[PDB]
């Protein structure tokens, strides 16, 4: 076996935490470095390969592309870190005073039985001009060197019975850390979209926990170098259409996905197969560095995406097309 992963013991948790983030960029504008989502099944795409010097240059190619459900993300707070001889240490953390019920549930196991006495004294800390809150934020600006944002997924927007928002840290980048923490100041209680953190043709890597097998499975993996093809605004219409097809379609296949519901929010189409089965949370990171290769730089002229039911053999991409198929009705 591969000793790089042994011992093959249990994963730390269902959620996988990003162990490393992009190094630094003290000149580019402040922006996020990661995102969260869920495994929304898989689909198939056909595109023309514009790769020069290839055996299939300008020819159509079929490849399985995974779709990740990435509903907008809202910032609940920020974390400051300071370099120490014993490693990075968390200096102080702050909150937005209005943590959603989904976040409040994350701190309780018997939520129904609990009195639901979530952040109350800290919430009362906002009863003035922010002297207490600002002072804690000021020391982070004065002392902290790297700033990580505390954000959670809008679980209520996903077809999941959980309703328990997943909470994890995302590292920021940019110079003049004073601006970085100031950026978080504006985004308190505000939401962020994948379009502001990723773009088409960008290279990213995803980390998740593999499917179990009832000693097998249930391990964290970080399959690197996954290409983003399309970042669709799921809330808008014609998300599944293409420039050279111009027919209104939705990425959601007829009958939805296996063990997953419909998609009604932002999503990302990623090359390959991100580890983790359906309903598994996946964290997205961008390449850990400035990868430079022809494969990474090549753009994709998307032609058509398969959106047929997977519960058997599909025939049509939409019920409207099914009209070219009735006693039980008329």
């Amino acid at each position: 076996g591969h000793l790089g992963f042994l011992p093959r013991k249990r994963a730390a948790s269902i959620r996988a935490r990003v162990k490393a983030f992009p190094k630094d960029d003290r000149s580019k504008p402040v922006a996020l470095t990661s995102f969260l989502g869920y495994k929304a099944g898989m689909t198939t795409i056909v595109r023309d390969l514009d790769r020069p010097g290839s055996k299939f240059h300008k020819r159509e190619v079929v490849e399985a592309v995974t779709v990740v459900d990435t509903p907008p993300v809202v910032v609940v707070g920020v974390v400051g870190y300071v370099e120490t001889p014993r490693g990075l240490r968390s200096l102080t953390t702050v909150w937005a005073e209005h943590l959603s019920d989904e976040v409040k549930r994350r701190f309780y196991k018997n939520w129904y039985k609990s009195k639901k006495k979530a952040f109350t004294k800290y919430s009362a800390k906002y009863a003035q001009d922010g002297a207490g809150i600002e002072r804690e934020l000021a020391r982070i600006k004065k002392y902290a060197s790297v700033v990580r944002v505390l954000v959670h997924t809008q679980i209520r927007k996903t077809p999941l019975a959980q309703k328990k928002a997943h909470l994890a840290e995302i590292q920021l980048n940019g110079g003049s850390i004073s601006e970085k923490v100031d950026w978080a100041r504006e985004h308190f209680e505000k939401t962020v979209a994948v379009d502001s953190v990723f773009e088409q043709n960008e290279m990213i890597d995803a980390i998740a926990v593999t499917k179990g097998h009832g000693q097998r499975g249930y391990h964290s993996r970080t399959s690197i170098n996954h290409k983003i093809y399309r970042v669709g605004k799921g809330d808008d219409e014609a998300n599944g259409a293409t420039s050279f097809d111009r027919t209104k379609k939705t990425i959601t296949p007829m009958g939805g996905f296996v063990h997953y519901g419909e998609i009604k929010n932002d999503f990302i189409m990623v090359k390959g197969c991100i580890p983790g089965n359906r309903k598994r949370i996946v964290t997205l990171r961008k390449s850990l560095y400035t990868n430079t290769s022809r494969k990474a730089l090549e753009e994709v002229s998307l032609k058509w995406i398969d959106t047929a039911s997977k519960f058997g053999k599909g025939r049509f991409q939409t019920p409207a097309e099914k009209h070219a198929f009735l006693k039980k009705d008329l």
């Binding site: 370099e83 120490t84 001889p85 014993r86 490693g87």
Partner: protein, 197 residues
């Protein structure tokens, strides 16, 4: 004489410094070591670096976890040298080791307190002039230490704001010297010189 002795490891020999400190530990004297990353070892870099790798080989033939493991921090390297000079696995040895503290640089509150050096363990006073020597900083980094940059970076901040403290102290002592100088030759001052003070 001093309840807690703070020793600056800069410019000292690990073997000589460890042996001197080890005896004091067995004598009930508490000692704290600072700036261990700047500690030096005799011989050029290759010999010291080569010897460390040889020791790492013999950790354990079958399972490192069921055995010893190699600490990369410079303080741990000094601790390992001092540990072998103390009767470990005994109540007296274990208790004595509890009196010793080692840190890289000068973490507080030791930064605000006086630090001493061992004259019989300085490289200048022991190593022959012109001979090569090795510094723990390079040796520690070569064996996987990942905090040399952090220690060096924040140590300058320690060096800064300390000259300012001395600058204020130096100016204050100048006023004291002037006040003492003008008060000299008085009846009390003249009589004091008779008794040697």
């Amino acid at each position: 004489v001093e309840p807690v002795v703070v020793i600056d490891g800069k410019g000292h020999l690990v073997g000589r410094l460890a042996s001197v400190v080890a005896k004091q530990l067995l004598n009930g004297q508490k000692i704290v070591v600072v700036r261990a990353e700047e500690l030096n070892i005799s011989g050029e870099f290759f010999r010291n670096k080569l010897k460390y790798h040889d020791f790492l080989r013999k950790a354990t033939a079958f399972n490192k976890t069921r055995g010893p493991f190699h600490f990369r921090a410079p303080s741990r390297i000094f601790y390992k040298a001092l540990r072998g000079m103390v009767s470990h696995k005994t109540a007296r040895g274990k208790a004595a080791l509890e009196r010793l503290k080692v840190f890289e640089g000068i973490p507080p509150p030791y930064d605000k307190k006086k630090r001493v050096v061992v004259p019989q363990a300085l490289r200048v006073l022991r190593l022959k002039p012109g001979r090569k020597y090795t510094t723990l900083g390079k040796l520690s980094t070569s064996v996987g230490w990942k905090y040399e940059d952090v220690v060096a970076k924040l140590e300058a901040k320690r060096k800064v704001s300390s000259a300012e403290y001395y600058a204020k102290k130096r100016a204050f002592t100048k006023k004291v010297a002037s006040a003492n100088a003008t008060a000299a030759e008085s009846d009390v001052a003249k009589q004091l010189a008779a008794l040697g003070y």
